[PDB]
Amino acid sequence: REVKLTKAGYERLMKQLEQERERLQEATKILQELMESSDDYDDSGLEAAKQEKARIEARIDSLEDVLSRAVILEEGTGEVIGLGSVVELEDPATGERLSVQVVSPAEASVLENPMKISDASPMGKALLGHRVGDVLSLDTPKGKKEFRVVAIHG
């Protein structure tokens, strides 16, 4: 489909491309050193390493593809987010969709479908009040995920 975004949206996505690239290279810069420190025998290295190279490649080239479907947006121009709202998401790097809805504390669960998550949860508080094509940064343990808000149906 078409892929719709905002000012910070773009940039904060781009920042990350720029971010991930600087990574790929330092990764490559490792691999050739190993493929070089070769008069050795591979798997601990060539494995993790080549794999790691790709991870990022695929990550990268993923974000790239996205930012060309990109259509920018005049701010404040859209449905917002409150409780009714159910929000469809995807993560720019990896594009793994994920759909949830904001709900009063008591009818909150991970059992229902488009998961019913709480307005007083981080992710609640956190995804509260943004628009389609906004890009968010929620807290993971393992650091921090970023999602395109992919239409606030509801």
Distance between the termini: 20 Å
According to CATH, what is the class of the largest domain?
A: Mainly Alpha
Q: Determine the strand fraction and express it as a percent band.
A: 15-25%
The number of helical segments is 3
State the CATH topology of the largest domain. Helix Hairpins
Determine Rg (CA atoms, Å).
19 Å
Structure summary, number of beta strands: 7
What is the 3D shape?
Answer: elongated
PDB class: transcription
Keywords: anti Gre-factor, transcript cleavage, transcription
Assembly: monomeric
Entry title: Crystal structure of Thermus aquaticus Gfh1
Written description of the protein model:
The PDB classes it as transcription. Keywords: anti Gre-factor, RNA polymerase. The chain is of the alpha/beta class and 154 residues long. It is built from 3 helices and 7 strands; from the N terminus they run βααββββαββ. It has helices at 7-34, 45-66, 122-127; strands at 3-4, 70-71, 86-90, 98-103, 115-118, 135-139, 144-149. 17% of the residues are buried.
